[PDB]
Write a protein that binds this ligand. Structure first.
Ligand SMILES: *[C@@H]1O[C@H](CO)[C@@H](O[C@@H]2O[C@H](CO)[C@@H](O)[C@H](O)[C@H]2NC(C)=O)[C@H](O)[C@H]1NC(C)=O
Length: 361
């Protein structure tokens, strides 16, 4: 199985214990570590944070301890305008300038591949994403001729049917990618005007939940569109999503006034790291969605959908049963990477839980 794990460069800036440098990463934890995100500047791949050349070195030096570990650099992300990516991909000359820039930058910095994280292509973009994947792969096949192991090429693909349909020609892009990480953890958000889970495995029955907004639908759809199971990696979050309640109701369809209050460390309304969630659960009421197979918790006027050891283990069992290529984790710096918050004295509890199941029958 693959265990694809994202590291985010902006985690460095979180205060105190929240602060995450790549030497926090267990070199034998994941099969692949993906550093997020690279810029595109002057129509070439480029660094984003001021100290990225040092952080890339600190990540890549993990390979002296686990020579089999693979690293990738993810280009794009949500602070990169989809429109910016569209302009580069849609023109022959800019596309080529970008593609030619990628192997030398990855080699200089010690990366084994590129992850494409265009978030996300519009309807007019779908044909250009296809060309970009094809031509990037062709360039990596050519660069391999000079004697180094061929660069890997992956992509991060949203799991909502509507975004898949708009932006992605899954049958074609899957031919050229080494793996696709399916982003099966964005199925609910404050835009809705109720509580709900963002990473359910299956639909809620009871009495209100749409049939596409779950991981099983998205996996099945990707496979039906032509993505081979041996290229499909299912995303599992280590973060949870928070809401502010509009009433005393906390169950299904409970109204919300907006995102939850920021976490002490992550400092973003609507999202909490798992280490923050472990702390939140002190004094909280916990519940599970029985059909969806994922938990939530509530204290005061705050309501949190999250994943725990049990839920990620159950997701890992699913993807094994479906003969998928493995799991992706978003993100290492959102798991309890210190191992001190969740009462287990265990670094990376959720990632380790996943790995424990992938290393079983
Ligand atoms: C990412 O690359 C963009 C593209 O070059 C950078 O945006 C440019 O930055 C310079 C200096 O601020 C500006 O003059 C350009 O006009 C910007 N162009 C555009 C299209 O925005 C951006 O600063 C880079 N991002 C980071 C984090 O390095």
């Amino acid at each position: 199985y693959k265990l694809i794990c994202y590291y985010t460069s902006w985690s460095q800036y979180r205060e105190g214990d929240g602060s995450c440098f790549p030497d926090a990463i267990d070199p034998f934890l994941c099969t692949h570590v993906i550093y997020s995100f690279a810029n595109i500047s002057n129509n070439e791949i480029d660094t984003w944070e001021w100290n990225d050349v040092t952080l890339y070195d600190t990540l890549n030096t993990l390979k002296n301890r686990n020579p089999k570990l693979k690293t990738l650099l993810s280009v794009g992300g949500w602070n990169f305008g989809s429109q910016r990516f569209s302009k580069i991909a849609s023109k022959t000359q800019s596309r080529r300038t970008f593609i030619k820039s990628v192997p030398p930058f990855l080699r200089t910095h010690g990366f084994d591949g590129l992850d494409l994280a265009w978030l996300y292509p519009g309807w007019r973009d779908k044909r250009h994403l296809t060309t970009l994947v094809k031509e990037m792969k062709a360039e990596f096949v050519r660069e391999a001729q000079a004697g180094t192991e061929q660069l890997l090429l992956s992509a991060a693909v949203p799991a909502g049917k509507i975004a898949i349909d708009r932006g992605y020609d899954i049958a074609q892009i899957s031919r050229h990618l080494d793996f696709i990480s399916l982003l099966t953890y964005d199925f609910h958000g404050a835009w809705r005007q109720t509580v709900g889970h963002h990473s359910p495995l299956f639909r809620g029955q009871e009495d209100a939940s749409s049939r596409f907004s779950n991981a099983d639908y998205a996996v099945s759809y990707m496979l039906r569109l032509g993505a081979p199971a041996n290229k499909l990696v299912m995303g599992i979050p280590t973060f949870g999503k928070s809401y502010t309640l509009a009433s005393s109701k906390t169950d299904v369809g409970a109204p919300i006034s907006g995102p939850g209050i920021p976490g002490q460390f992550t400092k973003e309304k609507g999202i909490l790291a798992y280490y923050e969630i472990c702390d939140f659960l002190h004094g909280a009421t916990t519940h599970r969605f029985r059909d969806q197979q994922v938990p939530y918790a509530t204290k005061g006027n705050q309501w949190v959908a999250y994943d725990d050891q049990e839920s990620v283990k159950n997701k890992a069992r699913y993807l094994k049963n479906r003969q998928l290529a493995g799991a992706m984790v978003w993100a290492l710096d959102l798991d309890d990477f210190r191992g001190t918050f969740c009462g287990q004295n265990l670094a990376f509890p959720l990632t380790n839980a996943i790995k424990d199941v992938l290393a079983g029958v």
